[PDB]
Write a protein that binds this ligand. Structure first.
Ligand SMILES: CC(=O)SCCNC(=O)CCNC(=O)[C@H](O)C(C)(C)COP(=O)(O)OP(=O)(O)OC[C@H]1O[C@@H](n2cnc3c(N)ncnc32)[C@H](O)[C@@H]1OP(=O)(O)O
Ligand SMILES: CC(=O)SCCNC(=O)CCNC(=O)[C@H](O)C(C)(C)COP(=O)(O)OP(=O)(O)OC[C@H]1O[C@@H](n2cnc3c(N)ncnc32)[C@H](O)[C@@H]1OP(=O)(O)O
Ligand SMILES: [Cl-]
Ligand SMILES: [Cl-]
Ligand SMILES: [Cl-]
Ligand SMILES: [Cl-]
Ligand SMILES: [Mg+2]
Lengths: 266, 266
């Protein structure tokens, strides 16, 4: 439950930066690590400091000489034709394309990324990549290298932060979330050459001016991510432990990405 | 049916930066005004761009020659002895005092202020006061003057951003919320001696270190404000109108504050 008395009731003693730091280290997070993090704050139990405590815990373990990455997706900038949660009437679609504010990395909020991401993306020295729908944010040693020159088309492909993490043999940390939140599997979708290309649209700043920009991407499908996860855990290497009440998973990104790639091909 | 689904169903046509701007001007908002704003995003009906659209619209009307203020309270940094929404076990109280992260204006999230406020406070050039519980954020001409040197004790009193708005002869804008959100009437409580005083605490950064700090504030009571609002409205100086579906009010802060002060003494 997300109701606060349920969250408090689910906890024996407060989670603090210190208890979270200790839990992260026991799980295997280390100084210098490159790690992309996916989370649910409520899954942990009651935390003194809320999202701030988790971000500060992560930074305390990883440090400046490591790199933290988080997806900072902004799907409400997408073309409303495809919307289902909820869908909007068809008479709104062109109004939306004409009026939805352009992606601006320092301004545009994330949607369905979680409070930990909203907190993290506003930290000083956090760098955001340039994609109106599928951006990422990063902090630490490789933050610039990982976020720079993201392509508009194939947002999760070979010219994405996912590929840069892959190149650096980075880790994926899932905090109280499952494989449907594992963005890195999108890179397996692209490399499989299986899933379908679709025409997508989003508002960007182009020539110092708002344009509704059309481009090409994959119709990424998170349901096959969960299937991959189930199989990956029966076969591949993944570490599991708890942060407060959250069941967490830590894994090498290259292991899951390569497994996913072969899975999609069959 | 999900919150969002009902929001869409109660909207005939999408709210945009342009329709919100147009509605704001229609209501009476003008270039160069000093205005403190309180809002519910969902009350407007469906907005293309959500919180961003509302902030941008306010900025387009007021301009940098005016000033926008919003409360940015972070009450989850306070001494848990006083918590009721929700309370936590007493065994936790010292742990929390020892571990809750210190307020840092560019980082600490708000509680119960709304997505509009969360968007506004991290927007570029927006400035936030120093108070660890009762801070305010501002943008524009008097942003720095309004937010500088807020006293630790009596966070809503004669040295708070509320007094500075008062001296500037500013306005209050309520967007789909009632008098119980009208923070400025806290100033009336302070001046009349209405509400009770309490020992509170919070953590700050002082001389480079996290210090848990004790101080005095008033136990501000929102319920009183609604009765006051009723009576002050009868007196005829509140402009009312809609922004999308939101019932909005625009009034002079001096006028409501002076009325509330009188209201409490008698
Ligand atoms: C394939 C892809 O690429 S998908 C893109 C990748 N996506 C992700 O990484 C998302 C991963 N996270 C998730 O999927 C999550 O399930 C989410 C974010 C959708 C929802 O998780 P939640 O825990 O409900 O939300 P979130 O993490 O934002 O936390 C806010 C909640 O924390 C709780 N909370 C508030 N304060 C505290 C505190 N001090 N301590 C503990 N919990 C708290 C509240 O319940 C709050 O819920 P509310 O806003 O309804 O009141
Ligand atoms: C006296 C004092 O000092 S009290 C302190 C002063 N307080 C304030 O000024 C805050 C005033 N506002 C309120 O009190 C409000 O009632 C709140 C903010 C407490 C509740 O209002 P809400 O409309 O529920 O929340 P909020 O304004 O944050 O908007 C977020 C909601 O908008 C809705 N929403 C999201 N996107 C959109 C969109 N594009 N268009 C329209 N609505 C949307 C969602 O349902 C979201 O709810 P969720 O986050 O639970 O999914
Ligand atoms: Cl590493
Ligand atoms: Cl690619
Ligand atoms: Cl869990
Ligand atoms: Cl601290
Ligand atoms: Mg920023």
């Amino acid at each position: 439950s997300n109701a606060m008395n349920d969250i408090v009731a689910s906890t024996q003693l407060p989670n603090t930066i210190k208890t979270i730091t200790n839990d992260l280290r026991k799980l295997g997070l280390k100084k210098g690590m490159t790690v992309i993090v996916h989370s649910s704050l409520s899954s942990i139990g009651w935390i003194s400091g809320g999202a701030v405590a988790v971000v500060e815990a992560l930074m305390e373990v990883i440090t400046e000489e490591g790199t933290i990455i988080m997806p900072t997706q902004s799907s409400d900038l997408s073309d409303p034709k495809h919307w289902s949660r909820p869908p909007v009437p068809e008479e709104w679609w062109q109004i939306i394309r004409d009026n939805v504010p352009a992606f601006e990395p320092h301004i545009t909020p994330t949607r369905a990324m979680g409070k930990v991401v909203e907190c993290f993306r506003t930290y000083p020295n956090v760098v955001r990549s340039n994609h109106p729908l599928g951006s990422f944010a990063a902090w630490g040693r490789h933050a610039e290298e990982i976020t720079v020159n993201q392509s508009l088309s194939m947002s999760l492909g070979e010219e994405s932060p996912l590929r840069k993490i892959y190149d650096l043999d980075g880790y994926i940390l899932l905090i109280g979330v499952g494989y449907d939140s594992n963005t890195s599997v999108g890179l397996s979708e692209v490399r499989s050459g299986a899933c379908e290309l679709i025409k997508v649209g989003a508002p960007i700043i182009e020539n110092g001016e708002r344009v509704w920009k059309e481009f090409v991407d994959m119709d990424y499908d998170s349901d096959k991510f969960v299937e991959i996860g189930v199989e990956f855990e029966q076969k591949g290497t993944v570490t599991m432990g708890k942060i407060g009440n959250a069941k967490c998973r830590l894994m090498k990104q290259r292991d899951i990405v390569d497994f996913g790639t072969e899975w999609f091909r069959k």
